[PDB]
Amino acid sequence: MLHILCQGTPFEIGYEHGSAAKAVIARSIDFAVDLIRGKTKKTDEELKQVLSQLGRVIEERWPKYYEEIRGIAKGAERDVSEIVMLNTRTEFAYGLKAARDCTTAYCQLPNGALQGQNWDFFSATKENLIRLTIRQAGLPTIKFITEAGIIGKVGFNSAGVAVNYNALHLQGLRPTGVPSHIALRIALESTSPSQAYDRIVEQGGMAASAFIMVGNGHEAFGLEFSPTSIRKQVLDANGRMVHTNHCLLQHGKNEKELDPLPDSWNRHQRMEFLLDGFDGTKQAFAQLWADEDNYPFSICRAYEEGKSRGATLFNIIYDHARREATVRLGRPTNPDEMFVMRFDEEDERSALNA
């Protein structure tokens, strides 16, 4: 997969991403514009002004992330508004829908915890997946998988913090709140899961709804959130956490879950069942993600026109003991490719500002 090493100032980091992924980012934009236009009767000009407002929020609240976004825009030869769109796509789409009218697991194990997910979405975005290695002096070096143009998604850092992301649709939008991809980047820049939690909560509230899991070898948590709820999932009695695309946690009375898919319950039940028979081995853990019970709506999801709109587009497994992450692109039943990510001495020197 296209793998871009980004280092220096936030702007330089963004510029390297934007330049090397220029063609892919053009595709990401084309896809996002199509998605957005399907959600609304609003004119393009009006949408551009909404993007300007959201851009002003990011500029004020997270200057360093905004500078990176400006760099991506410059390198990809696109407007900042287009890159802002990419980085707030879920929120932007939720907002437009409201105006108009993934499977993840962590297992604590004595010989080394395992954590992973399948990411399921519209197949057209699979060809837009890239990976970034980001080195910033004095921060953990980050290695993550993302649709090109986006600054935080699913991956891990040199401090051992590993993150996963699942769609979740609780009602509510706060355009001044922290976007979910900014929260992912905040987590990826933290030195421990507890610091990630503290730093996410520090922002003082979420812009929309999602689920994020943060773990290392020692501890992990899940967060189900809306602009009016931040609830923590913790390990169960078997040392496991499983999350799909619906609320598992107790939320405030006014919280409202919007059109979750029936298979979200099915996959959660299925993964819990599969973990009951799981022997703890890395080989066995990897095989869980290729499960096809209730195909095409399975843990290893398939596109089937008229039935299932999306597919599993990649799988990632964090071997916490070794600080390695194995990525399988496409469906784990027959991956398009497979590679292992790990940190080197230079990744560690950047993190120590040495």
Ligand SMILES: [Cl-]
């Ligand atoms: Cl637009």
